Structures are given as structure tokens and as C-alpha cells.
Ligand binder design. Structure first.
Ligand code: NA
Lengths: 346, 346
């Protein structure tokens, strides 16, 4: 009853973030997304995240990776811009300098897909975190072994300037490790753990991936989003049915679409889309909660694309099948409803 | 008459091994499969086996190979996890250590596709055999030049701990060589050679590939499987019609699907699927004969996918065409019959 009303309401707020396809927009204004990862043999995950982002709607998707992984990733698609700049035969300052150059052309950096845990790549991600901190209009999505870095040095996300702009997407074990680091007692109420962790990490937005996804920034969900004399819940729960085939890169589809929605919503609040009929929202609660809306919309989208792929492929489904279906499922969840709602060609 | 009854019966037992697609299962529980091979120029076979396994239904398929072959294999699919750890510029203990790390995350290792006969790769396979022996819940499928190693050192399969968990898939010449090594007289009754060889190799399960496939572990096929006052046959014969176009990697499709069925059946007997409605079988004969059931189901499947590909492509068919058809033929042989039998979404 009220749960489907609330789900539809929050999804419509996420849809409000999406710029119209419009003659006055030029290349880049609908999102420049980067993926930092691709170490050694781990070249699938950064492809799934970056190509997922491109098929979802980024104008430009970049991969920032090691040379060996980058050579493979480039063969998967000429549309990806692959920067093989995380060369372990390069000085740390030379890597900082190259990373800063690429990052200065990004709206959002997804840290983690194929990152691994070795010292070189963990240092590269830490440099990326440090640079993104000081680029006040940069958003960050952190996944996979990017979250290994956060659990080892939580300060890399704590105390950032500008609007909040960080989304973490831990699986079950990554979530447990983050909770352990931040002294969050596992015996607490199940739906209170993610809000406590987000609070402990400075109100970053966290997608606690699970049978359902629990999404929180540790703050009550303001009246603009959550649906009496009681306080608004401090978490949202996505129970959208996904598919049953567990593909290895499902989480990279999530991070890529999360990054795009984060970029769109952040540019929206900044005013970039005002001249094409999408002015920023009046409500400051919406501005403060862009990462929650991006996370909620991406979680919803990710489950739906998993479901639609599974309906098509069944037991045989692999993550690569989902990449081909991102576009048609985007039209289902966001594009056609938004156009019919009068938001323009979404 | 009774032959089609028996074929249908044994296939239904193999279908009983397959876990349901189910919300309570998570990534990995429906099979982590590895392929050890890919030496020098021989990168097609390990792709066909690992991608065959993924399209058949493994959650995760890994390739363990040399760097040069691995670089090519990665370009074929971002969904394969390719470990380029069999570097001949690496110490033997460093290779043992890397192999153990990867193998500790596998249910089944398929040794042989693109392995070759050179000293380095034969040693890598022997290390893999030694490690798998001591990982009591690991299954092994041995094909192609993996069987060259067995004919040179048969003890690598003899006297293993745990449930039986080895399947050999020799072609005609590999079968003749194994028989020669184990002193099996070629003048014996044709259907007695495979049971004698399996017995000599410690009741490993052997798929004697041929016009028909003769499958044996050297033991009588227990009452749970084989269909009076006479003893149950000690071999099964798959006469399922295959296609007529001899593609180079047909045997890799077989080994990949064999590995998946072996993983499913082994986890099934272990109890992993009890909580989703597939408890282990009551009959200990079924538990002891998982490798025979996996071999029988895979042999059946392999012929059917060859037939269906040939119906579609005729003279032009190549192995790559079969990879694309694994999913639809799995639904034909296993998925839809099993669902209609009430086993859940298979
Ligand atoms: Na290619």
C-alpha cells in the first residue's frame, strides 16, 4: 500500500535529476564518468562498470587502470576512453599528476572495480580519494576493494568539503568489515546498522546490498522524500525483484548506473540544466540528498535489469548480457515514464 | 524399449543434482569452476571449456593459464576470470602458492584444455593434481593433455581422500594410451575396456568417447541407477545422436558442462541445497556415483548441443557457434523438464 506509494515517489524524485536530451546540451554536459580500477588480471569489472555507465547514459566514460588490464579493456569497446596511467613503473607524483589531469575532466569517479588489494593500486585509489576530496564538485562511488581501502583508512571519506557526494556499495562481507572498523555492534536492529555506519562515516550514503538493499546517509529521510507525529525513517529499502542468476559483475552494473545518476543529480542541483527547463529543486533537502536518490534509483534499476536479463537468458545469463540490456531497461524505468511526465526526452 | 527407459531414468537422476535458481542462493553457490590450461598458442580450448561452463550454468568460471594465452582469452569475454599465473618466469613454489590461492576458491578444476605436453605446463598440472588431492571437496575433470600426464604418472589420480571426484574424458588415442599404461589388454570385450581401466585407476569415472560414449567407474551401476537375478551392468552407454560436423573444440564443451554438473552434484550431496528444497539423496549409491551422473548428463548434453548446432549451421559450424547455443539446449535437456518435474526453476 504505502510502500508502493513511497517507492514510486522516491523513484520520481530520482527521475527529476535526469537532464533532458536537448539540442542546447553539448558533449559532456550529460555526464563524464570515470572508473578507477583494472589491476593485473581483473579487467572485466571495470569494463562492466564503465560500459554500464555509457549504456545507461553517460556522455563519456573513462577507465583509469594499469597498462596490462587497459590493453584488454580497450579491445572490448572503442567507445571507452582507457587511461593506462596507473603504471607501477611510474613515480607516485607522476601518477598523482596524471590522475589529477584525468580527474579534472570528470563529474564522478567510481573507485574499486577490479582495483584489487595490492599496495600499488590501493595507493592509487588513496591518491584518487585525496584529489576528489579537494575537487569540490566531484562525486565518488566506492565499490569492491575500494571499500577495502575505506575499512583500512576510514578518514579518506570523512570530513569532505562541498555538498555530500560519496556513495559506498558494500556487499555483505564488505559491510560487516566496515561495521567492525567503525565499532558498529552487529547485534543491533538489522535496519539500524546501515544508518549507524553512514553516520560513523560522516553521513556518506551507503547501499547495504542484500536480499533487499538498505540505503542510508544516517539522517532522517526528509519530508521531500519519505512519506505524521513520527519522525521520517532514516533508511530506505529497495525490495524490487531482481533476477535469480548470480552473475559476477552485477555490482559493477550497479556502480556504473549509480555514478551516472550521481553526476546527473549533482549537475542538476548546480543549475547546469536550468536553461533546458530543469532548474534546481526548491527544497534544500533534495539538494542534500542527491546521493540517496542516485543510490535508490540505481538500486531499483540494477534489480530491474537483472530481472529482465534473467527473463531473457535464464541459467545461461552472464554480466555481458546485462550490458546489452541497460538501454532498454533504462527506457522502461526512467526514459518513457519521464517523457510521459513532461520532463522532456529522457 | 528398456534402453530409452534407462536413458530417461539416469538423466532424471542427473537432473536431481541441479540446484534451483532461488532467492536464497548467493553468488558462487551454483558453482565455481576453473580450467587449467592455455599454453603458448593454445587459447581456444580453455575458452571453449570455461565459457561453455559459464553458459551451462556455473556462477563463476576461471581460467588458469600462461600470460600470453591469457591475454588472448581475456579479449574473448569480460565474464571469464583469467589468472595468468602459470608464468614460466616464476618459481615453482610461487606457482604452487598462486595455484593454491585460486583453487581454494573452486568447486571443480578442469585440467587439460590447451595444456600441451611441454615440461612447464605438465608440471603445473601435476601441482594442480597434488593440491586437488588434498582439497577433499574439490572435483577434477581431466581432458586432452591432462590425460597425457595421467598416462605418464597414473598415481596422480590413484588413492584420493573423500568422496570420489575425478572424471577422465579420453578420446580414442588417449584411451588407448591409458589402457597401454595400465596393462589393459585391447583384445578384451569392447564394453569391458573402460570398466577395467576405471578399476585400474582406482574407480575414477571415465568417459570413453566414441561413436557412443562408454561411461564407467569400474563398479556395477547400483540399483538406484541401472534398470533381476543378474548383476547391474558396470558401464553406461550414451548413444544420443550428435551432429555430423566435427568441430575442433567439441570436447571442451563436454569438459565444461561435465565440470558444472560435477560441482552441482557434489554440493547437492554435501547438503548445500537443502535449505532451498533440494536435500541430499537418501541413497548412498547416488552419493558415490555423482561423477557417473555428471558424466552421463554432460555426454548427453554435449551430443544434443552438437546436434542442435549442426541443424542450424551445417557444414559451416564451428565450436564458437556451440557456445552461443549452450543456454537454449540446457533449457531443452535440463531446465524445462526439471521445472515441469517440480524441481524449481532449473
Ligand atoms: Na575482440
Amino acid at each position: 500500500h504505502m510502500a508502493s506509494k513511497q517507492h514510486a515517489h522516491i523513484l520520481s524524485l530520482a527521475r527529476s535529476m535526469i537532464p533532458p536530451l536537448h539540442p542546447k546540451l553539448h558533449k559532456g554536459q550529460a555526464g563524464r564518468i570515470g572508473v578507477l580500477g583494472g589491476s593485473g588480471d581483473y579487467s572485466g569489472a571495470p569494463y562492466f562498470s564503465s560500459m554500464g555507465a555509457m549504456r545507461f547514459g553517460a556522455d563519456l566514460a573513462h577507465v583509469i587502470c594499469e597498462p596490462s588490464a587497459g590493453a584488454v579493456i580497450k579491445t572490448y569497446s572503442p567507445d571507452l576512453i582507457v587511461h593506462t596511467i596507473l603504471d607501477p613503473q611510474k613515480s607516485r607524483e607522476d601518477i598523482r599528476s596524471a590522475l589529477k589531469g584525468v580527474m579534472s575532466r570528470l563529474h564522478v569517479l567510481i573507485i574499486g572495480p577490479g582495483l584489487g588489494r595490492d599496495d600499488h593500486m590501493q595507493s592509487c585509489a588513496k591518491i584518487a580519494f585525496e584529489l576528489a576530496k579537494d575537487m569540490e564538485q566531484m562525486g565518488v562511488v566506492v565499490d569492491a576493494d575500494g571499500l577495502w581501502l575505506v575499512q583500512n583508512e576510514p578518514k579518506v571519506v570523512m570530513d569532505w568539503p562541498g555538498v555530500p557526494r560519496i556513495i559506498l556499495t558494500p556487499n555483505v562481507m564488505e559491510f560487516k568489515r566496515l561495521c567492525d572498523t567503525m565499532k558498529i555492534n552487529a547485534s543491533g536492529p538489522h535496519t539500524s546498522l546501515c544508518p549507524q555506519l553512514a553516520t560513523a562515516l560522516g553521513n556518506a550514503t551507503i547501499i547495504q546490498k542484500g536480499p533487499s538493499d538498505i540505503i542510508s546517509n544516517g539522517l532522517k529521510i526528509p519530508f521531500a522524500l519519505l512519506s505524521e507525529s513520527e519522525e521520517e525513517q532514516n533508511y530506505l529499502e529497495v525490495k524490487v525483484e531482481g533476477g535469480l542468476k548470480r552473475v559476477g559483475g552485477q555490482g559493477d552494473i550497479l556502480s556504473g548506473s549509480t555514478g551516472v545518476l550521481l553526476a546527473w543529480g549533482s549537475e542538476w542541483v548546480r543549475g547546469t540544466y536550468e536553461h533546458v527547463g530543469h532548474p534546481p529543486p526548491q527544497d534544500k533537502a533534495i539538494k542534500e540528498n542527491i546521493p540517496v536518490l542516485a543510490a535508490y534509483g540505481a538500486s531499483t534499476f540494477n534489480r530491474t535489469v537483472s530481472k529482465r536479463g534473467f527473463q531473457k537468458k535464464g541459467r545461461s545469463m552472464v554480466t555481458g548480457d546485462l550490458v546489452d540490456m541497460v538501454g532498454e531497461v533504462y527506457e522502461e524505468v526512467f526514459g518513457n515514464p519521464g517523457e510521459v511526465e513532461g520532463r522532456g526526452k529522457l
